[PDB]
Amino acid sequence: GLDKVMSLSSAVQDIKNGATLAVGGFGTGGMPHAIMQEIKKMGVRDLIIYSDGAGVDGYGIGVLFENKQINKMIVSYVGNNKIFARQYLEGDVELEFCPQGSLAERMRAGGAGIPAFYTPTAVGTVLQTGGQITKYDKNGGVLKESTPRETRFFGGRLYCLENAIKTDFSIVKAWKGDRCGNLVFRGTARNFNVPVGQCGQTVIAEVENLVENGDIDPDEVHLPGVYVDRVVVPERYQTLIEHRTVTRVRQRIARRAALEFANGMYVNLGIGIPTESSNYIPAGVNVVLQSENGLIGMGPFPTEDKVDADWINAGKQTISHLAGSALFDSATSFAMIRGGHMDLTMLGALEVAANGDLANFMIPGKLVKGPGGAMDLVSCGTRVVVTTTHCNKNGDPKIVERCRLPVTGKHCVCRIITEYAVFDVVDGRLVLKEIAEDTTVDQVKKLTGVGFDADNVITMPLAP
Amino acid sequence: GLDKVMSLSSAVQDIKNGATLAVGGFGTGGMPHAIMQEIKKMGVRDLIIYSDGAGVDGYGIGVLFENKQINKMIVSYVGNNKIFARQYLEGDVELEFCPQGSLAERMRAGGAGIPAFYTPTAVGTVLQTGGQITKYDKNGGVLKESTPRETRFFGGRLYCLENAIKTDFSIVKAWKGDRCGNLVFRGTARNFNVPVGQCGQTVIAEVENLVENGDIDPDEVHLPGVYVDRVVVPERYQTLIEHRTVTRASTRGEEVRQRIARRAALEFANGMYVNLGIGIPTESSNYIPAGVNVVLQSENGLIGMGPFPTEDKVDADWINAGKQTISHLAGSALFDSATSFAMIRGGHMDLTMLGALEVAANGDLANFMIPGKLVKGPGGAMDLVSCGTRVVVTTTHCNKNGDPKIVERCRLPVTGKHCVCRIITEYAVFDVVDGRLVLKEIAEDTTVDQVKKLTGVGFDADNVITMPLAP
Amino acid sequence: GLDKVMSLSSAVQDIKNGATLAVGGFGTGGMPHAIMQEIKKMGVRDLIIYSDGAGVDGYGIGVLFENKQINKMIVSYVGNNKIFARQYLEGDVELEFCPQGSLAERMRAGGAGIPAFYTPTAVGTVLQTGGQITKYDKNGGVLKESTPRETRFFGGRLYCLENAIKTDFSIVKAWKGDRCGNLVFRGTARNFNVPVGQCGQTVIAEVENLVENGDIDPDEVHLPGVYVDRVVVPERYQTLIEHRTVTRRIARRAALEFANGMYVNLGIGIPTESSNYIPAGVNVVLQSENGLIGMGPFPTEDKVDADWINAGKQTISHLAGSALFDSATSFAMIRGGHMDLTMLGALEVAANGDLANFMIPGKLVKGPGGAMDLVSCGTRVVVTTTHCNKNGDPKIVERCRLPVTGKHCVCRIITEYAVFDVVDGRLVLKEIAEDTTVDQVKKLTGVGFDADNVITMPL
Amino acid sequence: GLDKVMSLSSAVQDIKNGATLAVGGFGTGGMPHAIMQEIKKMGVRDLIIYSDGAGVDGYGIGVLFENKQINKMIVSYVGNNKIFARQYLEGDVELEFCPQGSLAERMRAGGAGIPAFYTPTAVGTVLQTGGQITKYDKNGGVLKESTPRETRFFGGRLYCLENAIKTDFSIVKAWKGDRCGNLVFRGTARNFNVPVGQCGQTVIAEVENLVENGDIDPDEVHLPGVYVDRVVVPERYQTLIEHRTVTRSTRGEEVRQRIARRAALEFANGMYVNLGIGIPTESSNYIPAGVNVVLQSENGLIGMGPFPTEDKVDADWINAGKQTISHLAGSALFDSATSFAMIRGGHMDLTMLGALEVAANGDLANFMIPGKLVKGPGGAMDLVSCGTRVVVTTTHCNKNGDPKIVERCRLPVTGKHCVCRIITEYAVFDVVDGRLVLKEIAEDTTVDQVKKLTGVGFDADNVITMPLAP
């Protein structure tokens, strides 16, 4: 039928200065790095790029900071990208954070003819009220701040209005495509590529394998080719693996956390301490691990023989998969999260509050990380268990009356597990349920930043 | 891993009187017929069902009317179902129409934690303003009317608000499932089963084929098993074919439809993705010239639809919008109904051609007769004409009555507003240009002055050529 | 203190081509005609005018049609104005209808920093959905249609969103002003002058009387002077009386509708004559939407007055306990449901109770006026009409052929017979004339009904 | 005509436990104290009251606290009510603040059939975002917080949604009414009585003077009688005057005076102005001759004069600080809906007020501190979030040396991006493209001391010496 195959230079020649790009990829998996390299060679400037993150130094989108071809990034996660973090802090780049599920669904909405939609993600955070620094001056001052989101009540709960993202170009990467643009992706490298593929006016797909029309089973197409304008088939190149991970008080906190697992739960684990609770699950408890970049049935690190760059986790570490696992795109992944289909989420934390409040995304000025999917995980109805050390690395209490750092979520934590104690957030205040070791409740009183109404208290169990 | 397999009777035993159900299927394609039979057997009443359609007589949802187990249908289409029609007209059942694309996306929004969203579909129509007859009384008077829709302007255009649908139960059918619930569908029998699978508190999947966890390639899963609660594997059965249409003009009226088709066929250009309504628009696909390559989209979730299949190829999982068995060409892709109408509502078709009861110089389009007269349902048409993209109406110039079909403003209920770009009739081609009509072409067998007589508004008639036809 | 008095010609000399004006007045009452005369003199073109109506031929705004100085009228009623109707039908003027209470509240909003607000008025009518012809071509064909309104649910009910109106100029008239611009109005000549005076960048008031600052009691100002930029004092003229009505139906069957202590509204049309038939010891208060309660019958000859008129521009008297208020307050009163009964004239009415009484497309050009506000508040509704139009055809029918004023709103039936009612969305027939039959009635142009408890009439 | 006259006791007898009441009055002016007295005699409990303020100790609404007859207050201001302060703090009473203008317009919208409307007032403040403490528990903990407001963009600016207020009863005071309920108010005692009178299901009006139908000029009824259900004529009583102010030094006063005399140069002839109590009001006393301005008081007056002489004090003529006030030639009265329509629609040429904190942003904090004070928004939020020129006149630092002028407010904000100029005893600053430009300094100081006394950087390239009005 149709033939949209085209060379790499003619595919991207239409990109003017000032142009808007949506770019697929999660870390490096599914990041169309050949195409970015071509956008670099041709020297376009003042790009506005929407994408999950900004790749990494010397790869994908990260390439385009070098000659400063980027005016503004709209992004969920900065990741391992020193140059992006540098160009932000000293005023070369405008950085707009968007929660990852909101970004994905805004792209899908822009492809789907939906000008706006509602979500509980980000409500009462600085991403809804405005006044996060989007741009700085050359000498450290605030130049631009994020504009607020509108809000509406539905069934007595407040939601954010999100706007369709529609770009001049959308740049995707797939394992396989035919000449009329049907695409098949592999592993967690699908991610944003589906909704990015839907939201651009001209969409350019780099395929690792070009086939004839008729060779893709119509029932296993991931992105129908109606969405694709130009197909490019670059020189084959290894996909960058950030953390090539294989298997031949953090642990202590993790073990108490293992007891939160119930048999038959679908769970989402955040990067640090919550991933470690995974190791300590008792043998009689079976759960399905979901990774936000688009997988249920996440396995542990693979054997050396089996490492695949297309199979990575939320922390950009190579991963295996268990029996009955399933892959899906970033729009469906946060449908599933925002929809409440996880039975449990566990997250890291910079700060947590008797309010039910949590701060885990940015330290103003000092650490720029982004919300990732944390604002979507905390804002759905799912039980949230924060796993953190009791105090700051420099001894400050992490549990307090009101949060001092920008909040990831408002009224959203159900339980707090620390190495010392465990608290349940009850009716807006902290109640102490467990404590461990030599440490007494007395010790818990000054380590903590707030008082707790504790008629009862039990001793803290752990996992073998 | 997990095992969610159950017998057919354990699966449905906790569905209690008054339950809301979302049910999968488009016509009989992907209609969980076996779960519906069991729901008849256990005799539950006052049910509220959300589905694309209402089933046909004696199949799927249609089975539940026999003992009057249904209180309310929320639907895009009725069509073939006679028992339903009688029941509606006698006051036995409430019938609430919803645009098909809005129905699929509302189920999706329900599963996705999205309380509401916006769409240009149904704007300015009776489904926006309220007053479609939803319930009759027991003596043919109006008991209930449709609730209206809120609307809001974005970027100068008007949009309807649509609310998430969440049901107590969802009933889906799949070609294949595993024990932890991952489903793989076959053909256009996917359709509503994906969003329906997402929006229920308890989701029940009937599978033609059960396999073990690990037997399905993670990359080929269509509904992740997190969505599915209960999987049932009933005795194998033939999915009912509504219209067994196969491949192997003789009348005056059929020649006027052939003439319009032969003109509509010159609207195709190379590289177009098209949606053709059944009838003339679909018939024009048979006169596409040899160099021109187009791809047909079916709203039930296919691109690359081919002609009726040969007798050796008929397949119940492959059907079109009119429930006719179809083939498929090289480069074909299947997708679910949420994606299908994302594709449509997002303007990804380069050409959308359909018929009309009445079309206006506005560019407004009507496809439904006076309400309370005869019942149709919006189907996907409202979604199709709101696409923001090239709409071409192919229809006869006048009713058999002599009454014009092209008029100043619609007297019939509007399908969509300010959406038609071109009108093709057996006598003329009109363009809609800044809300006014321009005569571009006339057939060999008329003159301009007769076109004037035959049309219920004036038009710009300064540059008119003779209408050409595909061979 | 401040002195804003100007000559007439200086006050308006800076109005530029294509300027938007808001103009006070209801018919001719409170219509700043001397200012409209000066604007004609100075020849300005392509004007966009927000006003309740457009005056009348040869008066107020009517004057500006003569040299085709107006491009667009945003209005609730045309009134007895031939040249406005003519220029509309001939493709000379754009005419955008706006319900009267919305028009008044939108002007208050634009002066009050409220960008938008919600009202039930016009929901489900052709003014919400677009499709009211706003501009014709020179040959009788459509060219522009009204752009639709957004809607939203609050408490289960649907409301329209109305946008604030802010104009370059506001033109008002008052009985009395001081030098710092404090205005005092007289009779029902207040009407839109208050909200009009609040919504302009530059607001100009013609006063019939100029007094010094200090001569107006602070407690008696109707439009505080802050709102007024320029006060002009023309040579005194007679305000035009369209219908000089004097003494020397309330419904024979709707008399019963009236209790003691009711506040009742009478719309333009047959309702107005009813003020002259109030029973002697019944005790109700009549409301006129141009801004009165305590309306009475037509005045005696020595007491007629162009500042006391009713909705139909007839001269009126007022009873003890009367209160005058502006059009913003008048429609808040109505929209908020403080009337116990309303009664309206009709073009046609339907059996389901939805009613149409505001226009027939391309032929009778009238406007919604306050009708759309009156039908969509909480208040009991009753229609009064001839049984047939002048062509001898039914005025009562099954469903409305003509555009609706509002849906499922009419409860009463006075014509040359009566009684029907709507309960739970359907009509229940309540009374039968004399000992005559259901069958005459059953030959209802519209529908089936409950005949289980029918009864004889109290007329 | 109609006759709605009744005795006091039979008019209030229909009020049941748990009833919502809208209550007119601003301070004590136009407060229906005799009806409040009667609601206390009849003993009804669990009341929810919407009113401008919470009354004062032992008068109007203050009387109801004595026997814990009140569950909830929705007000714009708390002020000199000690019973209520304690009760709020000890968990006996819920307190929801509403900006005064939004409160008035909500009541009007209630009476006017408008379920909701938009306003720039309170956008980006704790009154939009939620988290005002509304109810304590019995031991100093938080029990309830305020629910957020919805927001919407119109022409690229964000607005708050406000919902109609509809109460079971509305209670109003008027100088004069007739038997059919037409009411005439006097002085600034009109205020909320107009919109309160429109929003209640049953409205009850105490009148100081009853007259017959036909005794009031129909052209000068303030509240038409269709809004009134019951009229009541108590025994005549003197209205409590909170502050009897009349017209017939230290270093701290010298600072405020210098600030006042610079602020006086902000006035130009023909301006209508709203002046905060304190330094901004003081500044009107140094207006150069031949500069004429009209002062507006948010309780419903333009043309406010200085304090009255002893023979002309009048409880019905007070300002926003509830001080007795005179009026000048060409003054006008209006109700509180119209007051805030006038403010919110930008019809002041200049608004001047104090501040606890002001930001290089133009952001201003001057209404609250969590858990440490309750005053309420009052009219300040409305006054600063229309597009009118706002000038902040305030001392440069706190008495401890903490700067009041900072990069970003730590204190809860009153308005977002709204201050144009800041006048202190040391410096004048303009807010320009979201940062501070130092325009002037006192003869008393240096550019280097103001750098040290202010908590942000600023452009100090074109500084001039600060002039003063004589």
Ligand SMILES: CC(C)(COP(=O)(O)OP(=O)(O)OC[C@H]1O[C@@H](n2cnc3c(N)ncnc32)[C@H](O)[C@@H]1OP(=O)(O)O)[C@@H](O)C(=O)NCCC(=O)NCCSC(=O)CCC(=O)O
């Ligand atoms: C009241 C009406 C319906 C007019 O009705 P009347 O009571 O005068 O009845 P009428 O004299 O029998 O009819 C008036 C004219 O309508 C024509 N007519 C009546 N029925 C007809 C029909 N079926 N077909 C064609 N023409 C018809 C008659 O010829 C007559 O014109 P001829 O006699 O000339 O042949 C109209 O003014 C109207 O309602 N306008 C909308 C405003 C409204 O309803 N107001 C309520 C609030 S008051 C208001 O809003 C207006 C405020 C303002 O004026 O600014």
Ligand SMILES: [Ca+2]
């Ligand atoms: Ca494209």
Ligand SMILES: [Ca+2]
């Ligand atoms: Ca479930």
Ligand SMILES: [Ca+2]
């Ligand atoms: Ca002005």
Ligand SMILES: [Ca+2]
């Ligand atoms: Ca009442």
